[PDB]
Design a protein around this ligand. Structure first.
Ligand SMILES: *C(=C)C1=C(C)C(=O)N/C1=C\c1[nH]c(/C=C2\N=C(C[C@H]3NC(=O)C(C=C)=C3C)C(C)=C2CCC(=O)O)c(CCC(=O)O)c1C
Ligand SMILES: *C(=C)C1=C(C)C(=O)N/C1=C\c1[nH]c(/C=C2\N=C(C[C@H]3NC(=O)C(C=C)=C3C)C(C)=C2CCC(=O)O)c(CCC(=O)O)c1C
Ligand SMILES: *C(=C)C1=C(C)[C@@H](Cc2[nH]c(/C=C3N=C(/C=C4\NC(=O)[C@H](C)[C@H]4[C@@H](*)C)C(C)=C\3CCC(=O)O)c(CCC(=O)O)c2C)NC1=O
Ligand SMILES: *C(=C)C1=C(C)[C@@H](Cc2[nH]c(/C=C3N=C(/C=C4\NC(=O)[C@H](C)[C@H]4[C@@H](*)C)C(C)=C\3CCC(=O)O)c(CCC(=O)O)c2C)NC1=O
Ligand SMILES: *[C@@H](C)[C@H]1/C(=C/C2=NC(=C\c3[nH]c(C[C@H]4NC(=O)C(C=C)=C4C)c(C)c3CCC(=O)O)/C(CCC(=O)O)=C2C)NC(=O)[C@@H]1C
Ligand SMILES: *[C@@H](C)[C@H]1/C(=C/C2=NC(=C\c3[nH]c(C[C@H]4NC(=O)C(C=C)=C4C)c(C)c3CCC(=O)O)/C(CCC(=O)O)=C2C)NC(=O)[C@@H]1C
Ligand SMILES: *[C@H](C)[C@H]1/C(=C/C2=NC(=C\c3[nH]c(C[C@H]4NC(=O)C(C=C)=C4C)c(C)c3CCC(=O)O)/C(CCC(=O)O)=C2C)NC(=O)[C@@H]1C
Ligand SMILES: *[C@H](C)[C@H]1/C(=C/C2=NC(=C\c3[nH]c(C[C@H]4NC(=O)C(C=C)=C4C)c(C)c3CCC(=O)O)/C(CCC(=O)O)=C2C)NC(=O)[C@@H]1C
Lengths: 174, 70, 167, 72
């Protein structure tokens, strides 16, 4: 998307509504469903990132031991930041319907960067995996209608699609 | 550079707040909805990381969801 | 735990923790209940404030009391302050500190500032619903399964004191 | 009285039985597993960074979505 091109590459935003929004949904697969799916991931972004870094850590507490890679506020903040970055790029892949920007602007060189820093591959794999599980659950949300923010239907295709994007992350950075 | 897409999805159908960020009307309920897409720096203050550490350091508790693997 | 609320942290383990749990109702379950609330405090606070707002979107309109980051931060801060005094009331098994250091004088303060009572009511009610669900937990469980409904009603009551105090 | 200080009790519960990092913060041995568990309590000023509130407004302003739990 060229309107979204310059975006995911200054500071000024981009706003898609009205007739353009109607046509955007005609050009992407399952436009209405896809926006619901994106909205539920990004509106829960904080709990997804927080729960994944926390779970990575409770499985391996040495990560915040004096020798662990998440020790000190600076390192923890950077790990939380990276988790959020990854989730945001995955969320854009779901919005766009492809992994072009994800691979080119987020995953490229990421494994060599983590190698050089000694950011541990197994913790990163757990962190992303948890974010994957959170995101699939939010897209496949199987709750009541008085507790579901969207019309009830079937989104297994979109869930499979976002799971594929998370797989691209884990395959690239480990 | 630590930037990432920041997506906002406004499904504001029936909201009394008049839209004014596009105004390119369409004659349907698509006139009360908007996808906003920006690119912004991702930041986590060391104060917020200190708060999350205090929430993680118990090593035991979790949300409703997910299996235990502590 | 009273030197704290009135600047050095208190560390209660070993024999001191053993005696504490003999001096309070259901000491082991009480500390699990506190653990499950406090370890989830960020999500509880933000979900309750977000829920107060999605029920009433004008709270972040230019006329609303959560508009601007200064106010939103103050609101998130207050909900956390309230949640923490409740968690301390559950830790200590009574509401005296809660009433004295948190609620005594809060309603008059909110009145002068214009902090809306109805929004505060919803925020507290959501934090209560959250906390009750973590104490009752409502595989996938960190504690041994059993009955924590007594502690859940206790913490529910401390929220109800907040609700009574600032409505 | 509520003293407008914004200070509140910050509680950390450590059930760290079997943990290879040794206890050292409490100073009264009981010869039970209580020696490997601790309740920490401080009185800290609660502050929410205007950065956080800003990031929080972006999650909230959609007015539609939520967590799994909760009625709409
Ligand atoms: C309905 C819900 C609302 C009630 C009731 C209420 O009191 N306020 C409501 C909404 C509300 N909107 C904003 C701010 C923005 N909303 C948008 C999105 C829309 N712009 C459009 O053009 C369309 C239709 C195509 C929309 C839908 C935008 C872009 C903003 C500005 C900020 C942003 O997030 O980009 C607020 C916040 C304060 C305000 O500006 O009114 C509120 C409370
Ligand atoms: C086991 C779990 C751990 C493994 C394995 C590991 O690699 N690190 C583990 C734990 C861990 N603990 C801390 C720090 C603190 N732990 C306590 C609690 C205990 N201290 C005690 O005296 C007793 C009982 C009497 C305990 C139970 C406290 C108070 C701290 C200090 C930090 C705080 O939040 O107050 C860490 C962090 C790094 C370190 O200090 O070792 C880790 C990783
Ligand atoms: C440490 C003690 C520890 C954890 C922390 C926790 C980590 C963990 N979390 C999941 C799965 C999910 N987490 C989700 C998150 C949320 N659900 C909500 O309702 C809110 C808004 C949000 C933030 C708390 C979700 C949706 C899931 C998926 C559902 C599910 O039950 O699986 C897992 C499991 C991941 C996987 O299956 O691979 C884990 C490990 N667990 C800990 O032990
Ligand atoms: C606006 C669209 C909107 C909300 C935001 C949301 C607010 C809301 N939340 C509840 C109930 C709960 N929320 C909980 C929170 C969490 N659960 C988790 O797993 C994580 C760690 C944490 C943060 C998201 C919990 C535990 C509950 C209660 C459990 C349950 O409901 O089964 C409510 C319900 C309040 C009530 O019952 O009065 C509300 C309103 N809802 C929105 O509509
Ligand atoms: C999977 C993600 C979900 C689910 C989603 C469904 N949504 C359906 C319809 C639908 N959703 C919207 C909102 C959407 N369109 C927008 O423009 C924006 C914001 C910019 C959003 C958030 C609309 C408008 C519609 C159409 C009908 C309506 O007006 O309500 C839907 C129906 C089937 C279909 O459209 O193919 C589904 C299934 N359902 C689920 O069960 C999971 C959780
Ligand atoms: C409601 C809160 C829960 C639930 C909890 C239960 N916990 C039980 C026992 C238990 N818990 C601990 C840990 C606790 N004691 C401490 O000192 C500290 C930290 C300082 C903590 C976190 C212990 C040690 C025990 C005793 C058993 C053991 O040695 O493991 C428990 C058993 C019943 C009882 O003891 O009366 C329960 C039910 N269970 C639930 O299903 C909800 C969600
Ligand atoms: C958390 C889940 C991890 C973890 C992460 C850490 N990453 C650290 C530094 C770091 N991360 C990146 C990649 C990030 N920047 C980007 O621009 C993008 C994509 C567009 C991403 C994904 C870079 C470039 C760097 C280095 C420079 C910087 O700090 O900005 C980091 C700090 C390491 C250190 O201080 O030595 C950590 C801790 N660490 C973990 O243990 C888990 C697995
Ligand atoms: C969020 C759920 C509310 C909301 C809250 C706001 N509170 C604001 C200011 C404020 N709050 C307190 C009470 C707080 N300070 C304490 O020391 C204690 C307990 C010991 C508590 C609970 C005070 C004293 C103040 C004023 C001084 C200060 O801000 O530190 C506030 C700011 C008002 C303003 O300045 O415009 C807000 C917005 N607002 C809402 O809409 C929901 C219902």
């Amino acid at each position: 998307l060229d309107a979204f091109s310059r975006v995911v590459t200054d500071s000024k935003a981009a706003y898609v509504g009205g007739a353009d929004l109607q046509a955007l949904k005609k050009f992407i697969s399952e436009g209405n469903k896809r926006l619901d799916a994106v909205n539920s991931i990004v509106s829960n972004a904080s709990c997804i990132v927080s729960d994944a870094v926390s779970g990575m850590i409770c499985e391996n507490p040495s990560l915040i031991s004096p020798s662990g890679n998440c020790y000190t506020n600076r390192r923890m903040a950077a790990c939380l930041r990276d988790a959020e970055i990854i989730l945001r790029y995955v969320s854009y892949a779901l919005l766009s319907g492809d992994s072009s920007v994800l691979e080119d602007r987020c995953l490229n060189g990421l494994k060599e960067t983590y190698s050089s820093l000694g950011v541990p591959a197994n913790g990163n794999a757990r962190a992303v995996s948890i974010m994957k599980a959170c995101s699939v659950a939010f897209v496949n949300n199987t709750a009541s209608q008085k507790k579901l923010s969207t019309p009830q239907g079937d989104c297994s295709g979109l869930a499979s699609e976002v799971a594929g994007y998370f797989d691209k992350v884990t395959s690239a950075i480990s | 550079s630590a930037k990432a897409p920041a997506i906002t999805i406004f499904d504001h159908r029936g909201c009394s707040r008049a839209p004014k960020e596009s105004s390119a009307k369409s004659g349907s309920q698509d006139d009360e909805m908007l996808v906003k897409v920006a690119s912004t720096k991702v930041t986590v203050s060391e104060d917020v990381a200190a708060k999350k550490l205090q929430e993680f350091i118990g090593f035991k508790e979790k949300g409703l969801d997910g299996s235990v693997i502590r």
